[PDB]
Amino acid sequence: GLVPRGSEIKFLKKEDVQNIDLNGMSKKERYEIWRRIPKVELHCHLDLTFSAEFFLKWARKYNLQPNMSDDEILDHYLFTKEGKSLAEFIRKAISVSDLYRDYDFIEDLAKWAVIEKYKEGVVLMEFRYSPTFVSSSYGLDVELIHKAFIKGIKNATELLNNKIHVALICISDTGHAAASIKHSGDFAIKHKHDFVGFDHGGREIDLKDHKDVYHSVRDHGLHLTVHAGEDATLPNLNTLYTAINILNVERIGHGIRVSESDELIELVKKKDILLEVCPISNLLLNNVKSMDTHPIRKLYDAGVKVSVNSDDPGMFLSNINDNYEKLYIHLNFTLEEFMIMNNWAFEKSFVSDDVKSELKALYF
């Protein structure tokens, strides 16, 4: 194991919380506090998780843009600036899938994604990836892609003395055909011993006809989440009703448009569903007007279970603690409230009771 004994993060105890004075601190001092929260992260797409330095290493290795500067490369591929559309994010994400050229990239991606989460002070990390997104550009074999992610992750956890625990959620393909829908859980089910969860993302659409396949996947022991209530542009909140009542999910990725309906606020609380909130993602994809008006404040105060998440660190060049900082500055979130949401994330995690008992003894 590579990290020296006394250099492991000094995670915050219930009993360190009140001694912390956040308002006395610099930005840098405050970031060390976000780091010391023993974080359970529920919503992060591993296939778009990277640092700037990882991305440039691979862009140079693949000789992608020999006449661009490092900054021009980041500008060219990524989505770090306010003012642009969801469409353009979609386009650059597809542009990024051009690096999925071989299994060495995939392994190294997983390895560094774990290392960076570990360094952020994440102790329990649910990563989700799409087998179809990863295989799409170079026609990589989904079995070998899955083995490469598991291998990258396992070898990083070995290096870190299991100081971080990692689990995997499978993102469904997006075929519209009845028979492709029927078979969209096949990969997740085949690999049920590696996945703890099943998800659906992409275009926010009518998922009523995913009823049967969501049920089939839960009948095989996998937990259910779904992206719904993200897309500001939709004319109604049907997708959210569908998530909760037809798909019967345990959690919703984003769910921020639940804030717009007292009925939905009440239903979520009733069904004890957690909302996997991705503040920076929401701002960058124009799903909120500003961070000042992000509805996580309203949802939290209304008694809805919500957690903090990063979504796509690579695309946004923003990892988990950056999301904490945003909530602090713009919405007056306190350490106390962060600790409360983290505990719900822990409770709503899809990992085994055994991984949970081990982490409860440590931090909760």
Added chain:
Amino acid sequence: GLVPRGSEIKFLKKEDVQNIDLNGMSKKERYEIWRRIPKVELHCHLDLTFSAEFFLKWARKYNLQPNMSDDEILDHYLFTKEGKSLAEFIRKAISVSDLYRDYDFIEDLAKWAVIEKYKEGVVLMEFRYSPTFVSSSYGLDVELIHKAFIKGIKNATELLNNKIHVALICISDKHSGDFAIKHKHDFVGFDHGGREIDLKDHKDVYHSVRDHGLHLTVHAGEDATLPNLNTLYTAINILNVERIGHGIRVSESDELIELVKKKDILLEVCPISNLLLNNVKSMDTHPIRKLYDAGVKVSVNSDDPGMFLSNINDNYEKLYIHLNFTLEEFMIMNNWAFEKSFVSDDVKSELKALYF
């Protein structure tokens, strides 16, 4: 110009094709018949129009895939195989947009696209391109994009001795409405592609562009996954377009069939496109037969020759094989396409003196 007098295409005369027996022809022999139709092509995205050899030339020039064979490069980038998704098409079009790295590429693309249409026996070619799509990957200057497309077309028309007339349509972003308007001298029409949902909000820009004398077409009634046909009613009643790109879902409504007809609107049908993106279940079931038989004005188009490695005569061949199209019906559609072309009166007078 470069082509000898006697090597120019001997085009079929409109009402003198009853002597031609297609059924006794080889495939190769039939292709020469399709070539000899003096074609008016209405719907083709210049920014996705290329041959395999053109693509390979630039693929190697730009060192895109040094460890791939030619066939692997074509499989990687292009969308020539049946039973793939519209999602994979979108993604491939984005991968092909990675070649828009400079203006030399765009010049050479537009030159060769014109030369190949001309070799196909296209006499009147309306090319459409999206300034936003072409500038999207490397942020090329849209003014310089437009200059490069105009110049490469002119590079080809100057070689070809007035044998092919080319015109441009602008495909939209309002900025692109503004762009179309600024370049109203170079564009004969305005279009909207991409996401078939609500063009109800494009109502005002469509009216604005119309005010500047650009003709109006729109992609609508293409997308099989749409839950209703409202995009068609919008295009017709709200945008008040002169023609509709694809429009094939017009076939699923007798009300739409009669409105299109009453409006004398033409449907720009793209057979191979529709099949490869699964907007029809098979060629042998493409709505163009029903539409044609219903009295609806329709024309034959290639859409995206480089994505599909299929140019205009390949589309004729499909229609002949699978949908019982005859040389007489091809001549009728072609004359409709001429009638519905957005080109000037001066250009039409010149072409009536030959073929129409």
